Amino acid sequence: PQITLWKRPLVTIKVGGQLKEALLNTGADDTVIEDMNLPGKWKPKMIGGIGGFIKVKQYDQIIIEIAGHKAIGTVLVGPTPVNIIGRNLLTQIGATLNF
Amino acid sequence: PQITLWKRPLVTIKVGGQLKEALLNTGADDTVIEDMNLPGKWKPKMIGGIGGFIKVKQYDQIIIEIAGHKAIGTVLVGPTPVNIIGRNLLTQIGATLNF
Amino acid sequence: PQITLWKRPLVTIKVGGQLKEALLNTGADDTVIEDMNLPGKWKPKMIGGIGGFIKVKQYDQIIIEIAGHKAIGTVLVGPTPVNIIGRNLLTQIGATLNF
Amino acid sequence: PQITLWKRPLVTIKVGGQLKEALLNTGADDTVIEDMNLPGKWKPKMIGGIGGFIKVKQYDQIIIEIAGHKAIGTVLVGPTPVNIIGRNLLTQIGATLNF
Ligand SMILES: CC(C)(C)NC(=O)[C@@H]1C[C@@H]2CCCC[C@@H]2CN1C[C@@H](O)[C@H](Cc1ccccc1)NC(=O)[C@H](CC(N)=O)NC(=O)c1ccc2ccccc2n1
Ligand SMILES: CC(C)(C)NC(=O)[C@@H]1C[C@@H]2CCCC[C@@H]2CN1C[C@@H](O)[C@H](Cc1ccccc1)NC(=O)[C@H](CC(N)=O)NC(=O)c1ccc2ccccc2n1
Numbered sequence A, B, C, D: 001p002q003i004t005l006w007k008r009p010l011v012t013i014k015v016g017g018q019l020k021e022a023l024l025n026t027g028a029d030d031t032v033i034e035d036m037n038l039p040g041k042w043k044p045k046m047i048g049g050i051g052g053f054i055k056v057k058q059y060d061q062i063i064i065e066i067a068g069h070k071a072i073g074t075v076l077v078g079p080t081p082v083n084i085i086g087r088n089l090l091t092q093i094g095a096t097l098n099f
Helices: C087-093
Strands: A010-015 A018-024 A032-034 A042-049 A052-066 A069-078 A096-098 B010-015 B018-024 B043-049 B052-066 B069-077 B083-085 B096-098 C002-004 C010-015 C018-024 C043-049 C052-066 C069-077 C096-098 D010-015 D018-024 D032-034 D042-049 D052-066 D069-078 D096-098
Touching (some): A042 A069, A052 C043, A069 C043, A069 C052, B010 B083, C052 C087, C069 C087, D018 D032, D042 D069
Parallel strands (some): A032 A069
Antiparallel strands (some): A010 A018, A010 A052, A042 A052, A052 A069, A096 B096, B010 B018, B043 B052, B052 B069, C010 C018, C010 C052, C043 C052, C052 C069, C096 D096, D010 D018, D042 D052, D052 D069
């Protein structure tokens, strides 16, 4: 798609077999999604940004569909108010910024 | 140009007559710049990042150049580790996210 | 051996009971072999090369012989144009880089 | 020096007068450096790996300091997450893979 930026870049994702909404975030290194029940092994990690850091669960090699594009990679699960797709999965689906 | 997301999409900006490096961010409408002495009228605002909420100063109709492309708009100034260009200004330079 | 690099460092490997040719790669974390029917359980994975990501099958604890050296480790199977031996298995044959 | 392969084989390099870290890569024909401003004439070229090919700037006769050893030859500049030193320069500094 050609995602425009007049509105929030919202897409449907599928994680843990469940459909959710998420925000495509070129300004995030990582992918972090709202606390959820997710199958798979995980380990603790901190991730940061404005206002400081939050503690999350780091799940490796998680299957996740982004607007119908398949990715399998690292998904952080924690206290974010919004599901954000970051560069680790944006690169997997071949996303670029263009102007 | 086209910018892959293998690395943070950092570009040079000009704001307040100064050159800075800034991150192109589809994930926020707001633009936030690290503390600096901009002239003119301002109002305080509270904004939320992943780690919590911060206080910024909001400056309106600020001239800003992004990767050589002219823009004018609202700039927030406060405690951010990285200069962040949000959707407000990204739309002015004709940026889209493509995959 | 002491392998000089005027040609690709290609060697014979044995995996799945089959002989194959593969490239010794200090630049790769993982080992990737062209699609083939290995027996047993596997996990999906996506790995990122210079031209993008490919989906692969991750087989763990796989018997593999590399240039006459026995090894046991993780082998990824998918659409690589060239069979690649990565650092995971290069450490088992005791490969070091000298200059 | 002699490097084991338990960690990524990163060394300090100098190219265009700038210090950078790069990966010593026996599994790469060519030397590919992340997009940067580099003086000199170049021509477009495609180079490939896992996932396909990318478009790069091919600079001839570029000087590159690799962990203190001088090497001169073809240097490709393009959209990669990692700087890699390939066989074309590894041969020049006498690099071998030993096991
Ligand atoms: C910029 C502002 C207006 C405050 N909006 C936001 O920050 C919103 C808030 C939303 C609700 C909370 C959870 C995140 C979403 C998305 N974010 C935008 C979102 O794009 C945000 C922008 C950003 C980038 C870099 C540094 C700071 C802030 N990115 C992030 O929060 C990601 C999170 C991550 N670990 O991937 N942070 C980083 O990628 C990042 C990069 C460098 C850093 C250096 C030092 C300290 C922290 C650093 N964090
Ligand atoms: C194997 C995997 C786990 C996916 N990791 C990687 O591929 C990482 C990714 C990193 C980030 C992007 C930039 C490259 C680095 C280093 N690479 C490893 C790196 O060692 C990689 C391994 C490889 C060799 C041959 C064929 C495919 C892949 N080599 C390369 O990507 C180099 C690039 C070059 N032109 O010099 N490719 C080749 O030397 C090469 C040789 C023969 C080929 C035949 C057909 C198609 C492509 C071919 N590419």
